[PDB]
Ligand binder design. Sequence first.
Ligand code: HEM
Ligand code: HEM
Ligand code: HEM
Ligand code: HEM
Lengths: 159, 159, 159, 159, 159, 159, 159
Amino acid sequence: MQGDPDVLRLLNEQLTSELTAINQYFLHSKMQDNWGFTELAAHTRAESFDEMRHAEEITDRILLLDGLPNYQRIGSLRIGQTLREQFEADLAIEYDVLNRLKPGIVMCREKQDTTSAVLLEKIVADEEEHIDYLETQLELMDKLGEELYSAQCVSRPPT
Amino acid sequence: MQGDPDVLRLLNEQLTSELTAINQYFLHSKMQDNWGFTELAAHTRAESFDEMRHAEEITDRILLLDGLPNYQRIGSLRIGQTLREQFEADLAIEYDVLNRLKPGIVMCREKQDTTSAVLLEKIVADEEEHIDYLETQLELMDKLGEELYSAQCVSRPPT
Amino acid sequence: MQGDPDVLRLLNEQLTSELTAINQYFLHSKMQDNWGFTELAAHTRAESFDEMRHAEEITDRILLLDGLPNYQRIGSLRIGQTLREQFEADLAIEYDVLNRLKPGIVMCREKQDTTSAVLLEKIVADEEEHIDYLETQLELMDKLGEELYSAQCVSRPPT
Amino acid sequence: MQGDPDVLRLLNEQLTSELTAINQYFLHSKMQDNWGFTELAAHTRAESFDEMRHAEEITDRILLLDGLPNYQRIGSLRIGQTLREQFEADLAIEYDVLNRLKPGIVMCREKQDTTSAVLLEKIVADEEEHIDYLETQLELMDKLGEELYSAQCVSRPPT
Amino acid sequence: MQGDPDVLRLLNEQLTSELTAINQYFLHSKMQDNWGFTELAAHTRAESFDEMRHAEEITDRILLLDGLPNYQRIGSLRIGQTLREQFEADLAIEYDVLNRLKPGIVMCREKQDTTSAVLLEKIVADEEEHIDYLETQLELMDKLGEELYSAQCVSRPPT
Amino acid sequence: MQGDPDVLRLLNEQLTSELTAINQYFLHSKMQDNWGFTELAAHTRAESFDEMRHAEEITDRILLLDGLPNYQRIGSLRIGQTLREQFEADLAIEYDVLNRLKPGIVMCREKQDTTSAVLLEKIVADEEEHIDYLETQLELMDKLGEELYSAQCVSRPPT
Amino acid sequence: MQGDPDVLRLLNEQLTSELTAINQYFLHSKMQDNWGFTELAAHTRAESFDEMRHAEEITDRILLLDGLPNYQRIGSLRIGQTLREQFEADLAIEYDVLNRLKPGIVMCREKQDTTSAVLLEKIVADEEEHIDYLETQLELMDKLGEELYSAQCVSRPPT
Ligand code: HEM
Ligand code: HEM
Ligand code: HEM
Ligand code: HEM
């Protein structure tokens, strides 16, 4: 059994994306924890875990289709030096995923590979949830003000 | 058994008020949860469930009296785009209920329909609490300030 | 994030459908209860809830896509006056959904909005099951005889 | 270890009969459930499961005697389009089994193959009971009325 | 309700394939058990059971669509006389499913029958997993050598 | 058994450091509790108990080394009069320990007293987490604002 | 609190090795599982998780020291093509760490940063155990024969 080659590139592309996200998300969570925004950092941590799970799932798909999963390649990280830049950085990678996946699923279906399209379909839904979560944080930051918003990310007492 | 025509019409009018309220309140909970005010959102969602229950209770009374429950007619929604706006809109519908129900109760008793009256008295009591809750929130927004009040409506961390 | 306008219009159209179904299904259930078809009534009730859930799900999708959910609009109720009439009425609405959704889905995918599409796919599947049930019920009335079918809808003793 | 050729041919014959039955019985059960006769459908389903076991049992025995089990061959399905037709079709396959097994056992015993004869005797006891159930159901259709009997086959409320 | 005649032929073809597989798989499990490869047989037996489930699922869909499930028609069995022959035989039936379904799902969507399409989309995923397992065992036979692989398919002690 | 003079001198210097800390931290905890900053106050108390254990472990090592633990000397306390002055005052002592134990740890390994050295290494590690926590608290006052950060140190409601 | 710039560069070097190892080890376990060597794959997975943990700890330390953990840089993966190539590759990376760390710790002690040294000493020790396991796996490959070794890496029955 061997996968369609355009599909495999697509998969590997997405995999590379997931790997970048695991790292960006994780380091952001540690940085959030270090700044003392512990309550937020757990959320951000969970996001990295979610991305890690996505990476494993793609990996299995690639392998079943007899491909080589690219563990070498890494994307470019945007590492935020503020909470606001951090959410912004995270937003950008998820948008990059949507931009790649929306066309990609259609291609997968045109290639008669429903299983792959289905996996990509799930990822897209998850990323949408994430983006929605991230944009709402920026919305809140303005509505509450930045300092007030930020106080909601610490614990009582902080750290 | 058959209801007094006037009472059934008052009951139907109240039903339309409930159906209106269920929607306005439910949508507002969805909106507040979506802007990330989740903790407030749970409260609003309950108040909507409360209206669902009233509506069912009015429906039962109507049917008992050989009436036709009107599920077709709906009131004019006031959808707010800030928390304040939302609170004020909900207040408005509650006030219309008191305006309708207060004479309506005195009429039910003249017609000798105590059971419909007691039902309506119960709704009045419930709407008075809601108004007290809403009116208070509005008070707090001023006392605390709007942003600070809003902050108390999000979890830690937010959403 | 922003939804394709057509997709959002589709979703809203479905919402309007759901809101009409909740009311028509609820009303029917209350009436079946009122006639003493308590057993049947509980199933119909459950159907109304399924719709209430479809309404919430669609409402979430719309908010996610920065759409404006329409809780103002409701459709034309078909309130049956016999079980057979109710069954036909309910069927008619379900068929309206299938007629809308089937092309709707194709469109969602062209527009590359899989998440919405999947949301609609589940709904279609759900409505197909509902139509099968109601159509079976009519077959049963014919096969059993109407009165004998109706007896299967009362508790022992009745109500 | 090597079986008698006549015996083995008899077992493969009975195996073909089972395979047929499993298909007929299962479909009929699926058919009764779709009609809304969920209560009868459960029993018929059980009857098919019973036939699955007999085919496994005969399958072991043939294998133990160094035989080739025939899973390629299927007999003529009789699919009923009414409950009465279904009960009759089911009875005919059952009587074909007794007709074959009764001389078939004496043959097994004559050939000095008791274990094989014992397995067949058990199938016969089992088929006799199924036949009694079926013939009784037809008597009940005449005793009760066909519609009234059919009403005994649905839940409350239906499906 | 009434489905597309093409969708119903595809579902019926697939039904034939499922019944063929249930049979080849089950016999193969029994042959492996007979040979003393008990640990392996249990796995094989599960696979035939998985196909029994797919057969039922297809059946429900066909009946929902007012179609007539074909339980009379069977495929051509390939019964293997070695473990290697069996894996290859089973692989051959799976590849065939993939051949049928890959175009058919595209077709099902074209005809706006998402529920039938999703169902087959699921069978594709399952068959893909089963192929992956089967291709792996054959690879394990070359890597380990056949006798050694075979050793891994028996209990301690055997049967 | 006899400790090296230089080492014992170092253990005693540290012991003095620990008693000073116990007092300074315990009083800061009590003052913070007085001020109504009860939630922070609990974390501070815990820091004091940590020091109390450190003193005891040093005392035993000194006793095991035939030394005379100094429970008569104390350093100067910096009692802070705001939350900010307390955090700076605590940090200042923390740094005074690191400055002493860094060269001290090297010296112990030189006189060949690994056990004493490791005891110190642990203290240093512990002391490091303490500094990072305090240095993070001061940043948060800047980031959140002093009034806001302080509101994260009280309970709901205050004390 | 600022770490020594040399120590920080070392921590970052090691982080780089850890990210490299996490990927290699994870891919290798995914590949082994794929080949059906399930039993070995689980251990290999556990190894990758260990480096995931190493990575996290080193990250805290750099953050504690006001450092910037490099999650951008990854090293050359050596992906193995047989169980043997896989063991030999993972070994090579492990040896690279002992090489880097042996002098780094000494350096850390000189710059007087024991807590960093201690973390590294703990990595050096775990790495030794890993090397000893892998070295032993190769040895058993010779003692048993590659085929026989491999047979102990699969379950009964395989995958
Ligand atoms: C790149 C830096 C990474 C960091 C800092 C990291 C960190 C962690 C940590 C600390 C855990 C908890 C596991 C345990 O307690 O043993 C974990 C879980 C896991 N990681 Fe990673 N990891 C990284 C990369 C990866 C990659 C590239 C993969 C590829 C799949 C991966 C796969 C997993 C999986 C499958 C889990 C368990 C998820 C679960 O518990 O549901 N990790 N990670
Ligand atoms: C947009 C309109 C509505 C929406 C979104 C909505 C949504 C919901 C939901 C999500 C539930 C919880 C269901 C569960 O148990 O999982 C519910 C409950 C209920 N609904 Fe509705 N519903 C709506 C309209 C109505 C209407 C018109 C009535 C008519 C009287 C009604 C009657 C009820 C009742 C009686 C409950 C049980 C309340 C409780 O105890 O929590 N609902 N609704
Ligand atoms: C080749 C002849 C077949 C044999 C020998 C066979 C055998 C069996 C056996 C032994 C069981 C377990 C029975 C029990 O619990 O009492 C079973 C279960 C089942 N059978 Fe069959 N069967 C056959 C064909 C079929 C067919 C045609 C269908 C219908 C399409 C079917 C559907 C099922 C289902 C749905 C289960 C339960 C599945 C589960 O629990 O995982 N089987 N079969
Ligand atoms: C200078 C003022 C001090 C104050 C106000 C103080 C206060 C306290 C108090 C109230 C307890 C709880 C007692 C109990 O549970 O019965 C405690 C526990 C303890 N104290 Fe002190 N203490 C001081 C100094 C010290 C000193 C100098 C040492 C050792 C040299 C010390 C060692 C300990 C230890 C080891 C505990 C055990 C509680 C635990 O951590 O499990 N304390 N202290």
